[PDB]
């Protein structure tokens, strides 16, 4: 009963974990793009700026 109440508690413990891992994989996912778009733009600004001469 001890290792049965545990397995029944581990499923619970990690169902909240996968869900909590969701507010991360998708939260920082947006932050990756917010950085990718800003990388391509800033990487392109230096080129345009140094092309005006």
């Amino acid at each position: 009963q001890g290792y049965a109440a545990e397995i029944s508690a581990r499923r619970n413990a990690m169902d909240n974990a996968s869900k909590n891992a969701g507010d991360m994989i998708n939260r920082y996912s947006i932050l990756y793009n917010r950085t990718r778009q800003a990388v391509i733009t800033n990487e392109l600004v230096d080129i345009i700026t140094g092309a005006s001469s």
């Binding site: 391509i40 990487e43 392109l44 080129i47 345009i48 092309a51």
Partner: protein, 484 residues
């Protein structure tokens, strides 16, 4: 009488580009010859001056030099005369085997085949690689990208393909033959030389043509290399024959065209690449196609190579090519060290045509093989503790299926030697064998077939399909070897 119409004076020179005054009656993308001897092609036709890109060292050119027109757009001699010859980006010999008898010439920039004169890809290009022919089949006229990272086997894969072609190029039937064209763009001469000698020790160099635009040679040469070569092979397509061209590699051609455009004072784009960095690769690849029966039914298959940095495949150039090719073949470093060779990520590597351009005999035995592994990869993590029954067996299959997909270099297998090894896998006649001897199983099993069941192989080779009586006899031959 210097009339400025065919003659020109160098207004300025440097950065590998020469601004020239005059040359009034010149065409765009036309070649010109300098007093020094080295030549160049004119890209920028500005009002007063004309921008020419040098094919050699800019030192040779000086200010106030004389420039004469050639009257020729970038063109290269084509025909069978190149088969077994190594030429530069211009069609010039560099192997030292003497001049090259040309069966006519063709521009470097040729319009792609229309929408009407094309035929549904159905003729297969047997690579000889178990993982490739089974999982990601390549069709004639198709365009399968060989995408991956440095030192993963991108070239190793493309090479074995050219090697397996011996089975037909030594034959009499021209409709089954498949001439090859290897475009070395950026590679160092050492490597290109290394490649040739390797193709030589396999007698596959007699039906191949190597175009060499090494890292030493000028940028325009590496820019033209693919286009030029695309013509060399396009000759075969136009005459009812089949040709396979490998661009090793397109990632480096892009850089080359970037170098040209940047110096020519052209508007830069994302990551320095000019605007038409996509139209560059689009022009090229869309030239490869399988013509309709109307004209010749000839096919030009293309296997472009992209060198990806750190695995990133969302970069500008990489994603660009991908969105043009009719499928991708990915190679991971992870699997490469793990022991899986060729290291193919079936989860990402997928052909568009696929089934239609595969041997019907192979399509029958490996229909579910594609799925099996797709589900095996996700269940692979369950290794870390107890297995029921539904996932107890899945872990048994794939664990030896991929172990069988392992194939050593320079050892292409015929489709007649593939189906037996794939039948044993998918159906599950190998599930009960220790992995340690699965490798040696491939050999001993194939030698057992060739010796005792020679007939069973010769009907698959010739028919290419598996009949009810045939496939049944296949099972018996298999379970017979499982005992001994």
């Amino acid at each position: 009488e210097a009339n400025l119409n065919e003659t020109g004076r160098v207004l300025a020179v440097g950065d590998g580009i020469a601004r020239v005054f005059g040359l009034n009656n010149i065409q765009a993308e036309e070649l010109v010859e300098f007093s020094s001897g080295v030549k160049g092609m004119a890209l920028n036709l500005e009002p007063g001056q004309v921008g020419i890109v040098l094919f050699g060292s800019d030192r040779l050119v000086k200010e106030g030099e004389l420039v004469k027109r050639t009257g020729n757009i970038v063109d290269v001699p084509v025909g069978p005369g190149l088969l077994g010859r190594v030429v530069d980006a211009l069609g010039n010999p560099i192997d030292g085997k003497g001049p090259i008898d040309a069966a006519g010439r063709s521009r470097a920039q040729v319009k792609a085949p229309g929408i009407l004169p094309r035929r549904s890809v159905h003729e297969p290009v047997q690579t000889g690689l178990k993982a490739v022919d089974a999982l990601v089949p390549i069709g004639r006229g198709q365009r399968e990208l060989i995408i991956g990272d440095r030192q993963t086997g991108k070239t190793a894969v493309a090479l074995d393909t050219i090697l397996n072609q011996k089975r037909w190029n030594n034959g009499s039937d021209e409709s089954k033959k498949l001439y090859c064209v290897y475009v070395a763009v950026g590679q160092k001469r050492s490597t290109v030389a290394q490649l040739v000698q390797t193709l030589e020790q396999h007698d596959a160099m007699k039906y191949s043509i190597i175009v060499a635009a090494t890292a030493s040679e000028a940028a325009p040469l590496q820019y033209l290399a693919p286009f030029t070569a695309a013509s060399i092979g396009e000759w075969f397509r136009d005459n009812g024959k089949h040709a396979l061209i490998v661009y090793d590699d397109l990632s480096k051609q892009a850089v080359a065209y970037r170098q040209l455009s940047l110096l020519l004072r052209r508007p830069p784009g994302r990551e320095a690449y000019p605007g038409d960095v996509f139209y560059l690769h689009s022009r090229l690849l869309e030239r490869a196609a399988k013509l309709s029966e109307k004209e010749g039914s000839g096919s030009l298959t293309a296997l472009p190579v992209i060198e990806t940095q750190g695995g990133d495949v969302s970069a500008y150039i990489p994603t660009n090519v991908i969105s043009i090719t009719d499928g991708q073949i990915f190679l991971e470093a992870e699997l490469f060290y793990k022991g899986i060779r060729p290291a193919i990520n079936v989860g990402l590597s997928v052909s568009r045509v696929g089934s239609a351009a595969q041997v019907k005999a192979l399509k029958q035995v490996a229909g579910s093989l594609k799925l099996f592994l797709a589900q095996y990869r996700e269940v692979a993590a369950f290794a870390q503790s107890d297995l029921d029954a539904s996932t107890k067996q899945t872990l048994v299959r794939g664990e030896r299926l991929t172990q069988l997909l392992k194939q050593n270099q320079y050892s292409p297998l015929a489709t007649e030697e593939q189906v037996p090894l794939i039948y044993a896998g998918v159906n599950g006649h190998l599930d009960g064998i220790e992995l340690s001897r699965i490798g040696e199983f491939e050999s001993s099993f194939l030698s057992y077939l060739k010796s005792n069941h020679n007939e069973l192989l010769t009907e698959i080779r010739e028919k290419g399909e598996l009949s009810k009586e045939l496939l049944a006899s296949l099972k018996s031959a298999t379970e017979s070897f499982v005992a001994t």
